[PDB]
With several copies, the nearest count.
Chain A
């Protein structure tokens, strides 16, 4: 059935996530000795290993759609490149709580319209940068 059963908002992020995770599979064998490689391959490895950690989840705790969109948006833009892989889950856990407590009217628009408009993209860009700067590991 494919993309005919997705909302407009999820489609935009999942389109890029699909290709970025498809490129990583054909070079995953090189991961053991990757030091003696060019920068292009190491960039694919770096982005793929970051994207893998986001898909892990707990048990008996389903999420909501706009929170999934908000989580994946930071991942696909490269805002998590400099972090070490050991700390991705803690960052996701803290970011969800921060966005839930204060920024509720923003999530209302994503839930209502089902698509990411221009101004909402502009707002999310500032939100993620502010939180990332303030995280302090």
Chain B
């Protein structure tokens, strides 16, 4: 309650305000470029998934477990971006374990690994790093997909969770299914296509995985 304490406390906040004010413009400048490149990638991402849309494919009741993928960055100060994804990641596993499967979780982004480490340390299969400092590219999705197949773990089902840009002031959390299993792909509705083979379908699922990963990051 002396004069010196008041002076020091005023002089600290005077600097904090200017630091935040200068940090706002950089995020606006980055958001402009981030918005610019979304449109060319949206059509590619939608075009990748047309086949699964036209011919409905439903997974059966098997026990090969899932492969849940969550996407985030390594930086904070972004409101509740990471918490929303980490909320649904732990919600799905309860339903999955109700049936009983050897589910594993793979997360790209350090914050996702940090938040859920305490209660789901064993289910972690592999994690990535160095995300968000520079804009993502297709090569990163290629590297992730390449490193994902070499794992000895095999799955019949899987899903990927991400935040979808809706407006400059709002966003929506959603997930998309993966039917990359060859056996479930070979169903009645696929009989219309009449130049297929096992090798061709294996390569086709291989490519669809990288396409979905790139679309989610962008």
Contact = CB atoms under 8 A, between A and B. Distances in A.
Nearest to A41: B25
A29 B18 contact: yes
A135 interface: no
B29 A30 contact: no
A37 B188 CA distance: 54
A30 B30 contact: no
B22 A36 contact: no
Contacts of B18: 29
A38 B21 CA distance: 17
Interface residues of A, number: 7
Chain B contact patch, size range = under 10
B200 interface: no
Interface in B1-39: 18, 21-23, 25-26, 29-30
B20 to A, nearest CB: 11
Nearest to A37: B29
Interface in A29-44: 29-30, 32-33, 36-38
Shortest Cβ-Cβ A-B pairs, 3 listed: A36-B26, A29-B22, A36-B29
16 contacts: A29-B18, A29-B21, A29-B22, A30-B22, A30-B25, A32-B22, A33-B22, A33-B23, A33-B26, A36-B26, A36-B29, A36-B30, A37-B25, A37-B26, A37-B29, A38-B29
Interface of B: 18, 21-23, 25-26, 29-30
Interface of A: 29-30, 32-33, 36-38
